[PDB]
Amino acid sequence: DIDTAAKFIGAGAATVGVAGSGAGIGTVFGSLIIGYARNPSLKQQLFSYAILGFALSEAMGLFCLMVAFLILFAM
Amino acid sequence: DIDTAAKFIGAGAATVGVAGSGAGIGTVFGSLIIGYARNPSLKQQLFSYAILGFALSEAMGLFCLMVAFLILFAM
Amino acid sequence: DIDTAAKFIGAGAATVGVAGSGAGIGTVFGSLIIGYARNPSLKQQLFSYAILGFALSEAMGLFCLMVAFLILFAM
Amino acid sequence: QMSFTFASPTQVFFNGANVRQVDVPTLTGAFGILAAHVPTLQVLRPGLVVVHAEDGTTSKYFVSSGSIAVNADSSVQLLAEEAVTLDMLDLGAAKANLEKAQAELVGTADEATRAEIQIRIEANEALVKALE
Amino acid sequence: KIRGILYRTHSDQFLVAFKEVGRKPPTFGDASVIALELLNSGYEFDEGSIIFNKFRSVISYKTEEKPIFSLNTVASADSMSIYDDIDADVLQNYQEYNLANIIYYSLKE
Amino acid sequence: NLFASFIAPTILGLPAAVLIILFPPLLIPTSKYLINNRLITTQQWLIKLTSKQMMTMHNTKGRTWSLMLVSLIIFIATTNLLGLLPHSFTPTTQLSMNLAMAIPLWAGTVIMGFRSKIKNALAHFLPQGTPTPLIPMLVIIETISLLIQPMALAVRLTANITAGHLLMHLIGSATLAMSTINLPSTLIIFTILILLTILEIAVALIQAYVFTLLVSLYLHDNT
Amino acid sequence: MPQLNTTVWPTMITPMLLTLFLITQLKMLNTNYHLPPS
Amino acid sequence: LQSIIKNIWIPMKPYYTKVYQEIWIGMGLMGFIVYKIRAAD
Amino acid sequence: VAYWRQAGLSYIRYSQICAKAVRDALKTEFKANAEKTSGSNVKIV
């Protein structure tokens, strides 16, 4: 078969989109260190921006993992 | 066939474009934490840019998830 | 027909260059937050640079989608 | 919106004035200061200070040390220990004393008394570039 | 004069003293010197006040004391968190200069 | 033919891989005296500087491992450094050995985080200032990464000593090929091998300090 | 990859455990730092 | 076979019993992995 | 942390040399007047 074959390169190359959410979570939690080394009295408000940036960058990672698991098992 | 096979490799290699919409959403919310910890008196106006930047970098990510769902479902 | 099936790969792989622009727009609108949180009385002229940067990177993100539409249909 | 205050120990240039921009030579690198600039506080190094009046017309003084402090209410207090307008400095003695400073460093090897030469070197190096 | 008065009671509680104050009008060169030996003294002072005669008119003056803060109190105050580009060195250079000012402003009053 | 330096060494039918794993401790002599020789004076100083580094960040229960996490940076930093010798078989390029140093020190670290203090170890999976409405996604990360930390250690060290030896062995074969060709080029390929050997010396120590720091950081998060 | 030849794994596991846990540590227990005197 | 108690186990007594007790619980996990990996090969 | 701060100096000593340098570059019309309006006379016991 050539469908079951290509559906592995597809679902295998679709999951490179996680390379984005790898360096998006590294910047959010990287600049949180620089945002805290400057104004440590905002530790509760900063960390609530890091979790917002960690959940919105990773959500773009899931949208890729969601597609790789869509062109593999769903259809 | 050979087409329905390649349609999965093209739709997979196209949704890698989200990897640039995950490093942007990371840098925007990475500067919202740095910019707001420097001048917390501008919380409402700095956050009004981190929503524009979030929506404008994620608009280039949709342009890839769209051309993926064009080779995959339309043609 | 190995060529018509190849167009779905060259056109689905050219559109991953858009992931460059989408990462150079989060840098621009993440530098507009760091540069406005410092000297906010320049909001007018800064935003006329965060548009020259947005419209010069996102032009490179269109040169990729220009070849993606040059292989998929113009051949 | 800006409340400038530029004052030597013996002279006052501005006081509560409303200028739109100042360009000071801070030790951590120069920066320009418009209204609502982020609150900071620094210490100057030898260099110019350009003051942009509301009319867009400038004014250029050569501070030598001190401390600028932008505040939360857009007030600025620039205090220079010796702030002489460029119409009072000469180019010949700056370049000459810079040479007398540079030539005296190589003859010196102690960490302390050579550190006082580099500060005299950069103070004169910042002089030649201010005049012309 | 201020030494020769308190030299009797509190003489060991005395870091350093100065001369030649009064003959010539006090200049910043005098306030800058006094600030140096207040730092080249090995006294880890954690709080300070300078007492001078505030001039109001030809008829009357008042005595006054101005507070002098060290680094660990101006760097730890949570009201200094708004001040940008600040590290514990650019505060030291700013606290060492503001010692020569409050002495100069005192010598003129 | 290329991975020859990683096959289990045997001489005369004897598994010589045991006289190579037991040798590192032979280079660390000890003495009860008060003023000894230069070797034990420099070594007892390194062990002092090292133990003050990994162990200072721990509480009183974490400092009971101050014999393990110091006798481990001494065994990995001496096995790697004894691998840079010519033809040497360094047993840290083995996924077997590395998986045997990684799993116990890791399992014995989360167990004491699950057999005791468990109610506190349940709070590292959920960071402090975390809003709720997307928690059912974060639970996957903090567990599946925990379940793969023991394999991160053993492969971060295997793939860094293996690839370091493979590179030095290839660039070495390059200089051999261009030896009978333009020789002023051999001297530029060789000076790349020298800068690469100074790198593989540093990465021989760094890969020992990072291994025993990540085992330390796991411990610090469970004691 | 010769690392995957699992027939020689017990030849690498046991002499390691006999070194990381018994021989290297024993030599550390002999390295003692006495407290300084008055 | 003496001093295998004195030199070899007397020192390691407070560690092999109390401190490394959970290490062995992990070392059993490891042995189960190694045999299983060799079982499927 | 600048080099002079590593060399033991203080910003007062830094400012005394930078201000001396500016006056040393003043022109003779102003150099005499500027030096006495900022010269030092105090002395330590």
Descriptive overview:
Chain A contains 3 helices and no strands. With 75 residues, chain A is mainly alpha-helical. Chain A is rod-shaped, with a radius of gyration of 18 Å. Chain A starts with a helix and ends in a 7-residue tail after the last helix. In chain F, helix 3 (73-81) packs antiparallel against helix 8, helix 4 runs antiparallel to helix 7 (149-177) and helix 7 (149-177) packs antiparallel against helix 8 (183-220). Chain F starts with 17 loop residues before the first helix and ends with a helix. Chain G is mainly alpha-helical and 38 residues long. Chain G has helices at residues 10-20, 23-28. Chain G starts with 9 loop residues before the first helix and ends in a 10-residue tail after the last helix. With 41 residues, chain H is an all-alpha fold. The longest helix of chain H is centred in the C-terminal third of the chain and has 19 residues, at 21-39. The termini of chain H are far apart. Chain F binds chain H through residues 64-65, 67-68, 96, 99-100, 103-109, 111-112, 115, and chain H through 15, 19-20, 22-27, 29-30, 33-34.
Task: Provide a concise account of the structure shown.
Chain F is mainly α. Chain F has one domain. Chain F has helices at 18-21, 38-54, 73-81, 95-114, 118-121, 135-144, 149-177, 183-220.
Structural class of chain D, please?
alpha+beta
Instruction: Work out the count of structural domains of chain I.
Output: 1
H/E series of chain I: HHHE
- Number of continuous helical runs of chain D: 2
The percent range for helix content of chain I is 55-70%
> How much helix, percentage-wise, in residues of chain D?
25-40%
Tell me about the largest β-sheet of chain I.
Answer: none
How would you describe the oligomerization state of the chains in this entry? part of a larger assembly
Domain module tally of chain D: 2
How are the strands ordered across the major sheet of chain D?
4-3-5-6-9
Query: Which two chains share the most extensive interface?
Result: A-B, 49 and 40 residues
Instruction: Give helix and strand order of chain D, one letter per element, not per position.
Output: EEEEEEEEEHH
| Tally of alpha and pi helices of chain I | 3
What is the strand tally of chain D?
Answer: 9
Beta strand % of chain D: 25-35%
How would a textbook summarize the main sheet of chain D?
5 strands, antiparallel
Envelope shape of chain D: elongated
How many individual β-strands of chain I? 1
Map the helices and strands:
This is part of a larger assembly, with nine protein chains of seven kinds.
Chain F: H1 18-21, H2 38-54, H3 73-81, H4 95-114, H5 118-121, H6 135-144, H7 149-177, H8 183-220
Chain H: H1 13-19, H2 21-39
Chain I: H1 3-6, H2 11-24, H3 28-36, E1 43-44
Question: What are the main properties of this structure?
Answer:
part of a larger assembly; 9 chains; E: 109 residues; alpha+beta; two-stranded antiparallel sheet; 4 helices; 3 strands; globular; F: 223 residues; mainly alpha; 8 helices; cardiomyopathy (chain G); ion transport (chain G); transport (chain G); transmembrane helix (chain G)
